[PDB]
Amino acid sequence: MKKRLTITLSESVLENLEKMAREMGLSKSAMISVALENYKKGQE
Amino acid sequence: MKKRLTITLSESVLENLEKMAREMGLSKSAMISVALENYKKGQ
Amino acid sequence: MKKRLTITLSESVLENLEKMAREMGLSKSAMISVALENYKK
Amino acid sequence: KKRLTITLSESVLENLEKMAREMGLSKSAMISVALENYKKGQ
Amino acid sequence: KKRLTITLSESVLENLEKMAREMGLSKSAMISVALENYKKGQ
Amino acid sequence: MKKRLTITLSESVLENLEKMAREMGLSKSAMISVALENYKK
Amino acid sequence: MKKRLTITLSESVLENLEKMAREMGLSKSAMISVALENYKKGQE
Amino acid sequence: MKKRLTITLSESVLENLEKMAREMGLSKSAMISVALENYKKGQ
Amino acid sequence: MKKRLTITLSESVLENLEKMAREMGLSKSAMISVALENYKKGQEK
Amino acid sequence: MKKRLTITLSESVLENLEKMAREMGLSKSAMISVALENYKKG
Amino acid sequence: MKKRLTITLSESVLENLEKMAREMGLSKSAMISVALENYKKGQE
Amino acid sequence: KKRLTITLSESVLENLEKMAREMGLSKSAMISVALENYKKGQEK
Amino acid sequence: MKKRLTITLSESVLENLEKMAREMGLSKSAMISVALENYKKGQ
Amino acid sequence: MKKRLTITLSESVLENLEKMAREMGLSKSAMISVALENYKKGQE
Amino acid sequence: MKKRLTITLSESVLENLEKMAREMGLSKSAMISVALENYKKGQEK
Amino acid sequence: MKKRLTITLSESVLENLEKMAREMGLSKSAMISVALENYKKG
Amino acid sequence: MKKRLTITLSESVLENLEKMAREMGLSKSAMISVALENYKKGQE
Amino acid sequence: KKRLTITLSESVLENLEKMAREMGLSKSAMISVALENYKKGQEK
Amino acid sequence: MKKRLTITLSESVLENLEKMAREMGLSKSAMISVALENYKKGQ
Amino acid sequence: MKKRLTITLSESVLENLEKMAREMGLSKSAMISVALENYKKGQE
DNA sequence: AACCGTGCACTCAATGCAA
DNA sequence: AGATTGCATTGAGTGCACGG
DNA sequence: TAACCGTGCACTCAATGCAATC
DNA sequence: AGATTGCATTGAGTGCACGGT
DNA sequence: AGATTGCATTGAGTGCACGGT
DNA sequence: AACCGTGCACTCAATGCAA
DNA sequence: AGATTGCATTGAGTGCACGG
DNA sequence: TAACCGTGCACTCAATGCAATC
DNA sequence: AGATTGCATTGAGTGCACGGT
DNA sequence: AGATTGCATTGAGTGCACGGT
């Protein structure tokens, strides 16, 4: 299914994330997943 | 700062993350951070 | 541009909503948006 | 009957009013429907 | 918004209120839905 | 016993209704009844 | 599909039909179809 | 009285009617009338 | 076409006929036809 | 009393009547009277 | 199985027969059977 | 003393023979009897 | 066997017999057979 | 002067006649007259 | 485990490093790791 | 000036670094400086 | 393909070489190639 | 007059030979030249 | 061929040569080859 | 008393030397002194 | 097409007569 | 002294099967 | 025999097809 | 869109009464 | 017998109940 | 694991000398 | 009266390949 | 040579797993 | 139902400075 | 920047806009 994990981010990055999530209407977890997916997509 | 937080991900994503991080010699957190900054640049 | 609007839902639905959104890591607005788009079949 | 205010992309919104109008439903109803219905898909 | 009054067997009626209640819809809405939906079956 | 009730429908729907009933040789009440029963799937 | 036809009934029968239809929420045509179907069903 | 009126039926029903009437040596109208009275008796 | 024939009935019968047909909204001929079908079918197979 | 009347029957029923009458040894009029009486009690 | 036979009757009886048959809408043969049958039921 | 021919159900016939034999009468007589009796019954 | 035998009767009776026999369309012999069987049945 | 007549009967009937005659102490002729008288009186 | 090593950098470089890492919210080591991967991959296949 | 600093690298990257350095005939520190500079302009 | 060769340098030059290599973080071999290459670009 | 051995890209090597041949110098000399020039360039 | 030949120079010049050659780590011969090629290139 | 020295050059270089010497009307020795002088003055 | 009306034929029932 | 029977006559009781 | 039955003369109204309007 | 009805046709439903059997 | 509506209330959506067909 | 440092070996470049 | 050359000496310029 | 590099001693804080509450 | 966070662990990220080449 | 709500209106369903997180 799906699991959980704990991380650490620079206040700046957290801030920005918090920002991006809020604006895209996503949870922090979501946003991250999206970024991840998108990041990888653009890697191969 | 250096803030902490906990997230929830799809095994798939998680595993891929695990993979990407391992490959680039980065921690999960770092890999996330890159992705993020990266994502933001290029939106 | 992004328009705002006020609506009313049965406590029942609201909750559901609240729940679905929570699970899919979506905001209530997003959740609705999604359901809407999806719903057009 | 709980109230709440949301935000939608004009595109979505218009589509909504459209759908609602066609099915002769209020926007709130239309939503309630879509929501309950989505509950049955993915 | 046209108005009209109808007649239903208690069984049907109750079922209705039920359905409406569950889907958080007015009876009129519930009906509108069923009607539009039926339009898509037989 | 047979209960009565008053409702409101968009001119659009009403007409449709009126039409469907007419075609199936049903009264507006019957038509609804039908759609209702049927609709519970 | 379905066709049309013209008939003649005794005022009494018409009356009653009109009555039965009204009460069952059917058109005269419907009612008749029902009666027919039902009648036949109970014939074989 | 002896009132007239026009109805609409499904080819199937119609044809069956045609059949039932023909069999019982009755006109469509009559066959209808029977059916009706019959139906009413037994509801 | 439609075959015709003439018969005789006890007033009693006749009257009943008149009545039965009247009630079911059928002609005497029809009424007779039904009765007959009905009769046979009830002594059918 | 005992009156007379003229009717019309479809060849099919007529013949059938003819048969029936002949088999039970009755007149067509009698045959019909029977049928009618019987029908009545049916 | 239906069988046949020839008999003799006194004009009077024959006549009466013809008469009763006529009135009751029966064949002479039928009339006789009725009579016979009814006669039989006679006892017991 | 007129003659005539009739048709009867084997059953009927059968019983006729029976009755006749029993009463020591001819079938013709037997019948006559039946008829006469039948008739007598339809009076005051 | 249809045995035969001869008897004697009161003119009165004979006549009556002739009468009844003629009325019921039976031979004197049969008329008699009838009466006899008849008389017997009632013991 | 008290008329004679010759007849024919079924052995059975005859038989029974002689029976009833013997038992009643009546001649065959008498027995018959009785029965006839009796038969008649009834009928009336 | 995680291998360690020490290096030397022109203040210029160093500073930029400090900056780049700071901005992307990564450690100097990470920053370096990325740069390297990035570098190679861009001179990859 | 020109300062020093201690870092940590995953065997995989390290070895890779080692290779790269050797191939281009540079020191690991140089190799890294290059990579960094390059990265910057990327 | 990478090839090898042995050369001779004046202590002075050798030293300087060693020095420039050191400062620029290059191998002597690399340093030389740079030099060579750069030297070449020299004309035109 | 110290000696030492190096490694060069065939390309580099190749051009070295070329330049040397052209300038009538040994590869060692050639290089010396290059180095010295390289250096001179990194001054005031 | 690495042809050989003998020349005569100003003590002054010779010394300078010795100098430059020693500075650039080249043989007098090579030093000379350099200068020559060099002089030529500028026509 | 105006020093002598013996050297070696690549046929090509020599060749060109004789060339330039001939054209400039200078002895090989002279030509060389010129080039050297020239080379130096430049460098400075 | 399924019964009925009747003439051709035959044998026994239905009675008158008398030793 | 009616009743049993053989001798004699012909009408009753039915089959059969062609026409209606 | 006298009483039913079979039909041809005679007439209305039922039994339906059509189709412009609602 | 089925349902109402007037226009139009002819066959169904019976009365009646001379011949027939 | 249900359907159609104007009066009326409160959270378009329904209850009520006098006329209609 | 891919370059570098050097001793064993060889031939020609790099010069001094002088007829 | 520098310059061409043969005669002589040994350090420059490189290969090769075992150890680091 | 003199200048870099490789590491072991030493310490903080990042990088995550857990899980009672919201 | 994921998201917040305090409790708890240890490995990641660097400073520093003696030997080495 | 969006979300949460009390004020306000009219045909529960929405618009508005001052505070919150």
Residues 6+ apart with CB under 8 A from R13: Q3, Q5
Provide the angle, in degrees to the nearest 10, between the axes of the packed helices K28-41 and L27-41: 80
Please, what's the b/e burial string for D4-41 (b: 16 or more CB within 10 A of its CB; e: otherwise)? eebbbeeebbebbeebbeebbbebbbbbbbbbbebeee
CA of C9 to C1' of AD9 (A): 20
User: Which residues on chain S place their C-beta less than 8 Å from a C-beta of chain T?
Assistant: 1-11, 13-14, 16-17, 20, 28-29, 32-40
Pick the CATH number of M1-43 from 1.10.1220.10, 3.50.50.60, 3.30.465.10, 2.40.50.140: 1.10.1220.10
CB contact under 8 A, P13 and O37: yes
Taking the C-alpha atoms of residue R2 and residue R8, their distance in angstroms, rounded to an integer, is: 19
Q: Is residue Q43 helix, strand or coil?
A: coil
Best mutation site among M37, M38, M39 for testing chain L: the one with the most L CBs within 10 Å? M37
User: Is R21 in contact with Q25 (CB distance < 8 Å)?
Assistant: no
CATH class, range F1-41: mainly alpha
CA of J21 to C1' of X21 (A): 19
Q: Would you list the DSSP string of chain D? A: -EEEEEEEEHHHHHHHHHHHHHTT--HHHHHHHHHHHHTT--
User: Is G39 in contact with H43 (CB distance < 8 Å)?
Assistant: no
Taking the C-alpha atoms of residue S42 and residue S38, their distance in angstroms, rounded to an integer, is: 7
Alpha helices in E1-42 (DSSP H): 10-22, 27-38
User: Is L29 in contact with K7 (CB distance < 8 Å)?
Assistant: no
Every domain of chain S and the residues it spans: 1-43
Quote the minimal CA–CA distance from F11 to chain D in Å: 8
CATH architecture of structural domain J1-42? Orthogonal Bundle (1.10)
Taking the C-alpha atoms of residue Q5 and residue P28, their distance in angstroms, rounded to an integer, is: 25
Please, what's the b/e burial string for O11-44 (b: 16 or more CB within 10 A of its CB; e: otherwise)? eebbebbeebbeebbbbbbbbbbbbbbbbeeeee
CATH architecture of structural domain I1-45? Orthogonal Bundle (1.10)
Q: Is residue L17 helix, strand or coil?
A: helix
User: Which residues on chain J place their C-beta less than 8 Å from a C-beta of chain K?
Assistant: 24-27, 29-30, 33
- Burial category of R7 from C-beta neighbours within 10 Å (exposed 0-12, middle 13-18, buried 19 and up): middle
Residues 6+ apart with CB under 8 A from T27: T21
From which experimental method does this structure derive?
X-ray
Residue K16: C-alpha distances to residues B31, K22, L36 (Å): 125, 10, 9
Residue R6 CB lies within 7 Å of the nucleic strand Z: yes
- Partners of O5 in beta bridges: P7
User: Is O11 in contact with P2 (CB distance < 8 Å)?
Assistant: yes
Pick the CATH number of K1-44 from 3.40.50.720, 3.40.50.11540, 3.40.190.10, 1.10.1220.10: 1.10.1220.10
Residue A1 CB lies within 7 Å of the nucleic strand AB: no
Resolution in A: 3.0
Half-sphere exposure of N4 (CA within 13 A, CB side): 3
CA of G6 to C1' of X8 (A): 14
Residue P40: C-alpha distances to residues A42, B40, O16, T24 (Å): 19, 17, 9, 56
